[PDB]
Amino acid sequence: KVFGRCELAAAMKRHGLDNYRGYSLGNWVCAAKFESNFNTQATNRNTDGSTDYGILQINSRWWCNDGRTPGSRNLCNIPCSALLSSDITASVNCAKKIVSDGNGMNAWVAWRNRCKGTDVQAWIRGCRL
Ligand SMILES: CN(C)CCN(C)C
Numbered sequence: 705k706v707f708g709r710c711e712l713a714a715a716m717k718r719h720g721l722d723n724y725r726g727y728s729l730g731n732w733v734c735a736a737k738f739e740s741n742f743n744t745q746a747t748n749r750n751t752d753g754s755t756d757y758g759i760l761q762i763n764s765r766w767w768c769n770d771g772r773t774p775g776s777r778n779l780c781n782i783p784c785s786a787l788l789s790s791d792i793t794a795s796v797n798c799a800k801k802i803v804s805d806g807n808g809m810n811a812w813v814a815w816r817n818r819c820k821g822t823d824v825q826a827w828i829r830g831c832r833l
């Protein structure tokens with residue numbers, strides 16, 4: 705599914721991501737924009753042979769099982785395919801674990817490089833929330 709911007713903001717809010725670990729909703733929308741362009745079916749293969757999945761490009765080295773990332777963990781206790789669903793529940797639940805791991809949203813390098821310190825509330829401006 706390709707979400708609309710405000711559409712995704714609403715879904716994220718309903719699943720409690722808004723202000724989670726102190727990160728306002730616009731941080732999460734901005735991260736999703738630059739990770740996946742709001743496409744739940746996004747995938748990216750990394751150099752190391754792990755893969756990133758879904759709207760927040762969550763990786764198989766730690767977070768999900770894809771059967772093809774030697775040595776990896778599955779801390780969210782999900783198949784990585786669950787992160788590609790039109791329903792963002794599994795991506796949100798897993799993002800809550802990631803952002804709680806110690807580095808906050810810096811876990812998403814694209815958030816650090818493209819959202820951190822910017823006017824992230826612009827990503828939810830206009831939205832009926
Ligand atoms: C200010 N900018 C980068 C946020 C983008 N919005 C308008 C969707």
Ligand SMILES: [Cl-]
Nearest residue numbers: 728729730825
């Ligand atoms: Cl915000």
Ligand SMILES: [Cl-]
Nearest residue numbers: 771772773774
């Ligand atoms: Cl594996």
Ligand SMILES: [Cl-]
Nearest residue numbers: 725807808809
């Ligand atoms: Cl933090």
Ligand code: NA
Nearest residue numbers: 764768776777
């Ligand atoms: Na894994």
